[PDB]
Structure 1
Amino acid sequence: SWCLSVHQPWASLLVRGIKRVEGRSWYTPHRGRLWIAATAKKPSPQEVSELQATYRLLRGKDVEFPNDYPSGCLLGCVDLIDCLSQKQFKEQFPDISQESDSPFVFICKNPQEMVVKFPIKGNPKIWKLDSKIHQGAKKGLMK
């Protein structure tokens, strides 16, 4: 099983479905389930408030944000349906293409958030989950 580390608060917005794409400077052929881990970098409470304000405008004034954006832990997963270039992204998702300017744009569907979030240390790019933590995360989803 494969994982991507993402800075908070974006990491929790991805597993909640509020943020629908993730931009990177590199391509991956990976498709299917992609676990999402928060990096260790803690966001300032104003950074959280400004991002929350922006996503209310993009999604609707009553979007339900997570109460906490925990760092350094495994949060849940998405289905990585495509890794588009910025050109393909503008072509295929005109309504949200403004939401990432990155060279490659990861299209995420079916987000799932873990109720119990396990501590983890991440790596660059797409990296392989340890079996013991992946086993626990799979059993946490099926509850």
Structure 2
Amino acid sequence: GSSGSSGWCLSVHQPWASLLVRGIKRVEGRSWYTPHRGRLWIAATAKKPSPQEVSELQATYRLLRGKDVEFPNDYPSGCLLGCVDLIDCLSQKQFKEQFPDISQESDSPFVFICKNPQEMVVKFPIKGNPKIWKLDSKIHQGAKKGLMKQNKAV
């Protein structure tokens, strides 16, 4: 019937986190389901991406989307990167069923399909969480502003 059209933010574990707002990860892995459909800000958790996951994922995705993929210069932590439009959230079953091309991209039971990945120009000192949490009134705006400019790639 109705839902809070507020700017929510879902933290992610790098590098994936960045890969999302970058345009490589069009899906999110979570052990829970979120009927939230619309805009969802992606933030990089406090965890740091290992040199094994980045190097591996870099080559892994390169063959999943194309060696001509993109990749960030670094991977920050505890800051808002960008945002992704959550189209739908399928499960290990539906996800692959409909999106069998990215059935491996995620392992979680409930995959959150996102699109229009954009990385904000300015990051804010925020804390991530394994679940969905309403952004800070002050952050909401700033985040909407950081979308004034993008990298040279896009």
Q: TM-score under structure 2 normalisation? A: 0.86
Q: What secondary structure sits across from 1:66 in the alignment?
A: coil
Preserved contact between residue 22 and residue 119 of structure 2 (Cα < 8 Å): yes
Match in the other structure for 1:86: 92
Cα distance in structure 2, aligned partners of 1:42 and 1:75: 14
Q: CA deviation at 1:123?
A: 2.6
User: Structure 2 CA distance, aligned partners of 1:121 and 1:96?
Assistant: 28
The SS at the match of 1:117 is coil
SS at match of 2:67: coil
How many Å separate the matches in 1 of 2:61 and 2:49? Answer: 16
Structure 2 residue runs without a partner (length 5+): 1-6, 149-154
What corresponds to 2:127 in structure 1?
121
Residues 63-106 of structure 1 deviation map (CA, whole Å, 9 limit, x = unaligned): 22111111110001000010112211122112221222321110
State the alpha-carbon separation in 2 of the partners of residues 85 and 96 from structure 1.
Answer: 12
Distance of 2:26 and 2:141 partners within structure 1: 26
Name whichever of 91-100 and 25-34 sits farther off: 91-100
Cα 1:98–1:17, aligned 2, differ >3 Å: closer, same or farther? same
Identity within the alignment, %: 99
Equivalent residues of 2:22, 2:70 under 8 A apart: no
Displacement of 1:126? 0.6
Aligned residues: 142
What is the 5 A alignment of 1:16-27? 16-27=22-33
The DSSP-based 3-state class of the residue aligned with 2:72 is: coil
What is residue 152 of structure 2 aligned with on the other side?
none
Secondary structure of 1:68's counterpart equals coil
**Bigger Cα displacement from structure 2, 26-35 vs 54-63:** 54-63
| 1:7 alignment partner, one of 9, 13, 17 | 13
Shift of 1:130: 0.4
**What is the CA-CA distance between 1:117 and the residue it aligns to?**
1.4
